[PDB]
Amino acid sequence: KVYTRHGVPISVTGIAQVKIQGQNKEMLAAACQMFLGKTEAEIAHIALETLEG
Amino acid sequence: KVYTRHGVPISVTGIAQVKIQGQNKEMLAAACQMFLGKTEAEIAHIALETLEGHQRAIMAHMTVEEIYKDRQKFSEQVFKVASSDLVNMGISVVSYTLKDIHDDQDYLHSLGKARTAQVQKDARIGEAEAKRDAGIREAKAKQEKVSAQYLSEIEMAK
Amino acid sequence: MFFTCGPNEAMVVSGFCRSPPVMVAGGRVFVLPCIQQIQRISLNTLTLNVKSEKVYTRHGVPISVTGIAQVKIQGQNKEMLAAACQMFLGKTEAEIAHIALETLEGHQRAIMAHMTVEEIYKDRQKFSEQVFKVASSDLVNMGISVVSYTLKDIHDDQD
Amino acid sequence: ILCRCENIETSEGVPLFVTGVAQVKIMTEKELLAVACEQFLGKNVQDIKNVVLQTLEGHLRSILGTLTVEQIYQDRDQFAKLVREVAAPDVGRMGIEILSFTIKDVYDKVDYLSSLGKTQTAVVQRDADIGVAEAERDAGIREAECKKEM
């Protein structure tokens, strides 16, 4: 039920490959306290909803 | 079945908070021999009947209108008359109030009918002014709509 | 004997040679169990669903509204805390909730009367300010503070 | 306590039903405190409630009698002061203080109140309807115009 510049709707399946920037110790540390102890599936549901926005 | 300055009746539930003036040893001693050994319930029935007398008197000394509106003047009149009598009993009323004021006859319902009638004007005038504008606009809308339809249909015929 | 409480609670100790009761928020106190008594109060916030139905406005028109409030005790002010403490000591969070709920509706009803429907739904910011301006001073005498006020619902059966 | 009041009368006689609410405590000053103790030491909170309730209704009924319906539901600020001015000096003699007083409900069996809002029911209807019709103008004209051109 999407909308566009001219309101017209669409139905779309986008695909994304999320990864944690482990290479940056800063960013890794920042993300770590957000996801420590959480499963890959739990992390997936959390991330999914942000992307749709 | 009360009566007033103009005889008209009323039914009223007044409330009173009686206490003994223990602070005055004189009054306490005076009241003590009246109630020593008596229960709070027995003391209550004795006191209750005295208060009604003063109520009945004040009610007769007032109009219905003053009785419900002027509750302050009522309470003052009640204390002015009832206090001096109860003091001889060594009893004091902390406070007096009215919990209820009614009757089966329409006296009371009458005074507010003025407002029913006033607000009915206001409502009726709002409704009519508004519906008036609605009809005014709708009519003016109808004009161009039907006129343009015919003016266009004329070209279709041509 | 030592007694400890979390930061979410305050301990009040009264007894022998401790006539002015000692009040400690999130700490430890040495107490004589058989000669001194300890009482507690929860410092937690309560999310109150402050309903209103059959309301009226500046133009009398009614509304049905569900306001929400976050009450908390100003534990930070020892004065206000002490003042509120004797009002709620020994009472449960649920009992405190029913007591607070009814006060808030009064201010809601008043602000609603002081506003139009349009302002009530559009101008939620002005509404909240008016609510705090009027309701804060009263609740402060209760030693209670509203962290925040909001409107969850605004409706009526009339068009 | 919920200080209910029923079949009231007002400054213009009109009746009402009101649910008032009071927040109350024993006055925490030794003189007044001692005075209050003499009423309830050895007695229950339910006893305290039952006694206090009647006093509040008195002043409530008095203030209502002195005000109009509008003032009653709208002028809550004046109402509260008036409740503080009249009920506090009286109840204060009992050694008890009304911390705060409020109105939880304003209602009656008769239509009085409901009438005051009709005015704006019609205001918005009128604005809406005008809009509807002036859209039909726009639509009907252009629709008609297109048919010509085709």
Add this chain to the structure above:
Amino acid sequence: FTIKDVYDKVDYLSSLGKTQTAVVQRDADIGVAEAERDAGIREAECKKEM
């Protein structure tokens, strides 16, 4: 000494209050009719304009 009740089997007492029953009725009724004036006129007026 006080009086707790005043009554009788015959209507005597009841008559003394009728006077004001009628006073307030009269005031009320006048009001009702003078509101109908106001209403009826404006209602009638709106119908004209429409």
Add this chain to the structure above:
Amino acid sequence: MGNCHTVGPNEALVVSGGCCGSDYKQYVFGGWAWAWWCISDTQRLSLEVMTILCRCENIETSEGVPLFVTGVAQVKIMTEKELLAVACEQFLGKNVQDIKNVVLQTLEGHLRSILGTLTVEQIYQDRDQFAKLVREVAAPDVGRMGIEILS
């Protein structure tokens, strides 16, 4: 008798009473602490991100028109000692479900307010203005709870 307690970076541990005095709170956020069985109690709170579906129904807008909207919020306890302490006082000894239920109501308030200030077009299209407005109005309010809406 005393115990050694190890704490992860994701947890705020509060210990009341200890080697520095009577009337105090000991503040810990990862690492470890020493606790005496009857001289100091130990209580923990999670510092992790919590996210929620902030639904809103039968809305009204800048031109009155209603809507139904499903908003989503990513939120966490503010990781600064002042705000952190302030937040702990609401949930130490309480659940994530309790945190969710409380927070949800606050967001809906600001959401309903912002929606009331905007048109349908702005609402579905101007997501960028909407998000800023959500940051401008909801953050200073919810920030007083010691909680931050990450996005």
